[PDB]
Amino acid sequence: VIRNLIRDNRVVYGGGAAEISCALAVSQEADKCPTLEQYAMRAFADALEVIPMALSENSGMNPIQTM
Amino acid sequence: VTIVVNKLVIEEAERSIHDALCVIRCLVKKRALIAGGGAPEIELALRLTEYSRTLSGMESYCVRAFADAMEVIP
């Protein structure tokens, strides 16, 4: 954590905030790829949600509603 | 009003006139037309996925499945 901040002080908000924001960008950009890789890009969005959806599950909350 | 017009060729003609009346009845109740060949099913699948991003709760996962289901027709 210290070595990473020394190599680059730039950081992203944790607690699942980064994964949920990237999933929106990946979903919108999937519309611009007219090819069979489009279904994989949407799958990348849903796969990104599993990290934050797993945190709420381990804490004892409704995953999808909190997601 | 009555419409006077092989035994099989006349039967399909009655179906041809009934199906036309059904389509003509559709334009009456709904004065509009839409493209075929899976055109609305893609727009319905595309724009509903946009709404699911704005909603919250379980509706996003449910409305998204409603959108992906329309893609089976085309």
From Swiss-Prot, chain A:
Q: Where does ADP bind?
A: G15
The subcellular localization recorded is: Cytoplasm; Cytoplasm, Cytoskeleton, Microtubule organizing center, Centrosome
Its domain of life reads Eukaryota
- Could you say which residues bind ATP here? G15
Inducers of expression = Down-regulated in response to enterovirus 71 (EV71) infection (at protein level).
Record's comment on post-translational modification: Ubiquitinated by the DCX(DCAF12) complex specifically recognizes the diglutamate (Glu-Glu) at the C-terminus, leading to its degradation.
Quote the disease note of the record.
Neuropathy, hereditary sensory, with spastic paraplegia, autosomal recessive: A disease characterized by spastic paraplegia and progressive distal sensory neuropathy leading to mutilating ulcerations of the upper and lower limbs. De novo genetic variants in nearly every subunit of the TRiC complex, including CCT5, have been found in individuals with a broad spectrum of brain malformations, and clinical phenotypes ranging from mild to severe epilepsy, developmental delay, intellectual disability, ataxia, and other features of cerebral malfunction.
Q: What family does the database annotate? A: Belongs to the TCP-1 chaperonin family.
Subunit notes for this chain? Answer: Component of the chaperonin-containing T-complex (TRiC), a hexadecamer composed of two identical back-to-back stacked rings enclosing a protein folding chamber. Each ring is made up of eight different subunits: TCP1/CCT1, CCT2, CCT3, CCT4, CCT5, CCT6A/CCT6, CCT7, CCT8. Interacts with PACRG. Interacts with DNAAF4. Interacts with DLEC1. Interacts with SPMAP2.
Functional description taken from the UniProt entry: Component of the chaperonin-containing T-complex (TRiC), a molecular chaperone complex that assists the folding of actin, tubulin and other proteins upon ATP hydrolysis. The TRiC complex mediates the folding of WRAP53/TCAB1, thereby regulating telomere maintenance. As part of the TRiC complex may play a role in the assembly of BBSome, a complex involved in ciliogenesis regulating transports vesicles to the cilia.
Name the record gives this protein: T-complex protein 1 subunit epsilon
Q: Give the species.
A: Homo sapiens
What broad taxonomic lineage does this protein's source fall under?
A: Eukaryota, Metazoa, Chordata, Craniata, Vertebrata
Q: Which residues of the full protein are shown?
A: 408 to 474 of 541
Curated annotation (Swiss-Prot), chain B:
Residues annotated as binding ADP: G37
Q: Can you say where in the cell this protein is located?
A: Cytoplasm; Melanosome; Cytoplasm, Cytoskeleton, Microtubule organizing center, Centrosome; Cytoplasm, Cytoskeleton, Cilium basal body
Q: Where Phosphoserine occurs along the chain?
A: S56
In terms of superkingdom, the source organism counts as Eukaryota
Q: What does this protein do?
A: Component of the chaperonin-containing T-complex (TRiC), a molecular chaperone complex that assists the folding of actin, tubulin and other proteins upon ATP hydrolysis. The TRiC complex mediates the folding of WRAP53/TCAB1, thereby regulating telomere maintenance. As part of the TRiC complex may play a role in the assembly of BBSome, a complex involved in ciliogenesis regulating transports vesicles to the cilia.
What is the similarity comment for this entry? Belongs to the TCP-1 chaperonin family.
Q: How does it assemble?
A: Component of the chaperonin-containing T-complex (TRiC), a hexadecamer composed of two identical back-to-back stacked rings enclosing a protein folding chamber. Each ring is made up of eight different subunits: TCP1/CCT1, CCT2, CCT3, CCT4, CCT5, CCT6A/CCT6, CCT7, CCT8. Interacts with PACRG. Interacts with DNAAF4. Interacts with DLEC1.
Connected disease: De novo genetic variants in nearly every subunit of the TRiC complex, including CCT4, have been found in individuals with a broad spectrum of brain malformations, and clinical phenotypes ranging from mild to severe epilepsy, developmental delay, intellectual disability, ataxia, and other features of cerebral malfunction.
Official protein name in the record: T-complex protein 1 subunit delta
Organism in which the protein naturally occurs: Homo sapiens (Human)
Give the stretch of the parent protein shown, with its full length: 386 to 462 of 539
